[PDB]
Design a binder for this molecule. Sequence first.
Ligand SMILES: [Zn+2]
Ligand SMILES: [Zn+2]
Lengths: 257, 265
Amino acid sequence: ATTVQDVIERLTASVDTLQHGDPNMEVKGIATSFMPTYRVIQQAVSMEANLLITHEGLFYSHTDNTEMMQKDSVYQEKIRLIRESGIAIYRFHDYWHRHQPDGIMVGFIRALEWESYVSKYLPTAAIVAIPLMTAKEVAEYAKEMLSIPFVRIAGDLSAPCTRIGILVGYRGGGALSIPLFEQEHLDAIIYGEGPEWETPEYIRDAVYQGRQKALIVLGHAESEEPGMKYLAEWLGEQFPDIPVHFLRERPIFQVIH
Amino acid sequence: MATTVQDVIERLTASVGKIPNTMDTLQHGDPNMEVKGIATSFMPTYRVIQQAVSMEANLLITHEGLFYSHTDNTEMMQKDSVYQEKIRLIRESGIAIYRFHDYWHRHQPDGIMVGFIRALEWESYVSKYLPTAAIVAIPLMTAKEVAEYAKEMLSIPFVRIAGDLSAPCTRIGILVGYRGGGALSIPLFEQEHLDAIIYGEGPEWETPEYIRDAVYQGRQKALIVLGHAESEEPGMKYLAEWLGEQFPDIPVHFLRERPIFQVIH
Ligand SMILES: [Zn+2]
Ligand SMILES: [Zn+2]
């Protein structure tokens, strides 16, 4: 007779709020996803999952924008679907990141089958030491393992890489990323999203100065969806009598080239 | 009478009142130096500075900061050889570097925005200039066609599109630079009844997800994301054209940079 709040308690004790729904509802199935899109909510209904665990918020902000969205028709139609669906939606974000090895990062490393190459887990990043690959080869490897349509790369595509730093989510900014390059003697960094005018411009200059360095930018959702698939596997083991599944979304962007 | 660096600064900041703790400052050089040449750029990259020196332009006017932040970092400027070698180049360059950002955006028509609209040859289609956006009413194109048009007119290798590539687009909002976030973009979509928005850069979890859901709900809307430099370089090219008019004896050149990213597909 596991309830919504029972699941939240197990998640909160492995180491973020119930955006909607009855915490005392009995859980009949669980979906996980990076983003609680309108279509993911419809898919949860079709799967008869009445608890959706997602990484991001419901209404396109990390802050509470409910008042600014009250007159918005997209918000109104989404809240109408949520009320009709009877689903509960829980945002699981900070806890998973703050675990000893960050669970989002662990999921990413596992998706790339790089468990055996991890040199160290840092609070904000992980470091891997791999057999030599060019930066373009690392970019192609990540694209293939993650099954994503495109990646972006700054700097030297031919840079020989044996030490790589990984930062998931919106962690590509210069304050987190730039110090790692010489502190951990990195050839390249992989990250999800960050300001275009910070770490990529550092790499542009470094390559201009002759350094063989590069930056592989995956996409924010692309960098964190392995963590949410990993979460569904963990939840399915924690609750073996409740069906639990990851829902993947389509890429947010298409490239016009 | 010759023209000095501070002379150019004053001509640039002339019609805009003083902005409190703006970082539109002189990053390096002597304000009383005479200007033999002027270069404009979006970003003061290592190569941009080398080219300005090589062209004997001794005043570089750029939109962004010198060390990979909107706030330069003395901590980690000390270590890291990349920062060090760039500082060494600047010092031995003997050129003046002035960051023209807020005052450019706060010109009566946003100078970055006017440069962008000129580069797309869309001045005839402007419906209004808002403080932090422009609205254009264009001959009907699909969203994909708008994206392809922007890519061709700006001479850039790729653009990205969220939403409905089939969306019939006539009313388009434009936000240059890092203004694509939902605080600015989402109100505009329903206040100004936009079919699409073109912007430089913004959080992937804000406006693109709004449009994803809009399209899931049956709306025919799209988002075209150009890149930060791609959205603001035309504004610095236009600044070079303007500055040459204002200082006719001084050679003025716009220094374009490479795309920051290559796409692997
Ligand atoms: Zn995250
Ligand atoms: Zn700008």
